């Protein structure tokens, strides 16, 4: 976590998700500090048992024959049935999180709820992203078209 958290963008984006959502998508990719040392083997067993199932998995391969992959899947990934844990839909909330730390520069992110992936509106948002300006294309350039 410490190696990851010396980029300020990772801090900011994790807080951004914590502020945006009430549950599921609010959770951080990294373990909360108070839990380090408290995660048990039973919790790992339950997580694997109720998330690593056939209906939730996909086996992809480059440079491999199709009969081989089909044989492996039929032989060894047939004992992973038993679906479950429908989780919960992400309820967008809104809010603000402010971290006073006296760094040299101020990092800030401001967002709103936009659209689910796979929808036609998401393509419109991607185009809006590249109209506003997503990232630089020229080394030491002025971002003329941004």
């Amino acid at each position: 976590k410490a190696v990851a958290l010396q980029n300020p963008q990772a801090h900011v984006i994790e807080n951004l998700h914590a502020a945006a959502y009430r549950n599921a998508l609010a959770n951080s990719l990294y373990c909360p500090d108070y839990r380090i040392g408290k995660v048990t083997p039973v919790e790992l067993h339950d997580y694997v048992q109720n998330h690593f199932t056939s209906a939730r998995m996909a086996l992809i391969g480059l440079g491999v024959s199709h009969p081989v992959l089909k044989q492996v899947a039929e032989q060894f990934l047939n004992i992973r049935g038993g679906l479950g844990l429908s989780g919960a839909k992400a309820k967008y909330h809104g809010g603000e999180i402010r971290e006073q730390n006296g760094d040299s520069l101020v990092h800030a992110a401001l967002v709103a709820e936009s659209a689910a992936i796979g929808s036609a509106e998401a393509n419109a948002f991607s185009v809006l992203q590249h109209v506003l300006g997503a990232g630089p294309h020229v080394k030491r350039g002025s971002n003329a078209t941004s």
Binding site: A10, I13, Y30, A109
Partner: peptide, 20 residues
């Protein structure tokens, strides 16, 4: 180009440095 644009991804490997 330091500003974030896309959501985070966390990488871990057996014999390669981790990255974010």
């Amino acid at each position: 180009g330091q500003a974030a644009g896309r959501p985070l991804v966390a990488s871990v490997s057996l014999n390669v440095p981790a990255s974010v």
